[PDB]
């Protein structure tokens, strides 16, 4: 799996569940194409984005759709959206875990990349 | 002062000067309207960037450059920029101060916003 | 002023307002010795805690009582209090300022380490 | 494994290797006791510190040693250590997972607490 996103909630200690994820890549024309999405799961976590094979080097965007998270909630939180901007795979393959930790009026995001 | 910036450092233990801010407005054809711009000062904080006047509602992006940050320090860089990305809602009166801390494999932001 | 505190809540994106904080110095037999204590103004800020010629070399801690902060609020924490321990090093004028980012379930703390 | 502590290190991207950590409990007359310790996986990862039966209701203290983490990177970091103190098992058993992000002048600390 060389794309896995994992995001946790920090009001309530725990994964956070069924948020969107919206992974764009950088086209010729510097357009964002859509490139794989998905939803969290119960454990926070976010697998089968992508394959070795499709995962080329690039520009990537990963969209976390915190402001849907918070409202499913009833909070009304500050941001649309958490978005994380990157290069991947310009020296060679890697494994990327992007991680998410949310507030409402906060988050913060890691990566933590790997040499397989 | 509506909407103000402040970045720091979390390597160095400082704030972080010299960074360059650019501020987006969302418009009607849903594309991201150059707002405000500048580079963050000795306290790593830029003012000035907009007035009541100007700041009506909408959605808003801030996008720091970090990569170019790390990389005036020598050191690698994991993000192409840092974007946040919000609504600005009138609720009585209200300052908006968008906080980054930096690292380079890592980002927070936070959203802090006051009544006068 | 050498040492400040400064305590910012990420839930509601507001300083963090009328939080204990005490301030502890390490005594030559490896006991914490009160310093220094307050609560943080309506900014979130804690001044006024030391003064050039008291604030000496040494370890210090300081603690963040994050528990009533939230139990004033009706919301439920996970830590005691927050603590921050660090030797405070002479290396030419220094300021120190220790911020604190509050959610329930997680902080973070910044040390920001200036010369005026 | 009804406690856990995963480390990661923001500055390289990668999980904290060999960080050490000690547990404590609060005993009856106030003191800290030692419970557990350990050091980090090469997955950042801490496993088998104690058991559902050893790991009562309390006051636990969890010590990450950052200062010895970035001291054997060749940083001069500012904290000396990042202590996480909370009341577990107070509602009954539960596992909790104590998460540290690491720069040299900043961390995080984020718990998931889970009911098996």
Same mark, same amino acid.
């Given at each position: 799996?060389?794309?896995? =996103?994992? =995001?946790?909630?920090?009001?309530?200690? !725990?994964?956070? #569940?069924?948020?969107? =994820? +919206?992974?764009?890549?950088?086209?010729?024309?510097?357009?964002?194409?859509?490139?794989?999405?998905? /939803?969290?799961?119960?454990?926070?976590?976010?697998?089968?984005? %992508?394959?070795?094979?499709?995962? *080329?080097?690039? #520009? @990537? /965007?990963?969209?976390?759709?915190?402001?849907? @998270?918070?409202?499913?909630?009833? #909070?009304?939180?500050? +941001?649309? +959206?958490?978005? *994380?901007?990157?290069?991947?795979?310009?020296?060679?393959?890697?494994?990327?875990? #992007?991680?998410?930790?949310?507030?409402?009026?906060? @988050? !913060?995001? %890691?990566?933590?990349?790997?040499?397989?």
């Amino acid at each position: 799996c060389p794309l896995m =996103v994992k =995001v946790l909630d920090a009001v309530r200690g !725990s994964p956070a #569940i069924n948020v969107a =994820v +919206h992974v764009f890549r950088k086209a010729a024309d510097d357009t964002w194409e859509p490139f794989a999405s998905g /939803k969290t799961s119960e454990s926070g976590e976010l697998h089968g984005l %992508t394959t070795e094979e499709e995962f *080329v080097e690039g #520009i @990537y /965007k990963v969209e976390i759709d915190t402001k849907s @998270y918070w409202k499913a909630l009833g #909070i009304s939180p500050f +941001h649309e +959206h958490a978005e *994380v901007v990157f290069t991947a795979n310009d020296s060679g393959p890697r494994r990327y875990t #992007i991680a998410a930790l949310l507030s409402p009026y906060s @988050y !913060s995001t %890691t990566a933590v990349v790997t040499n397989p």
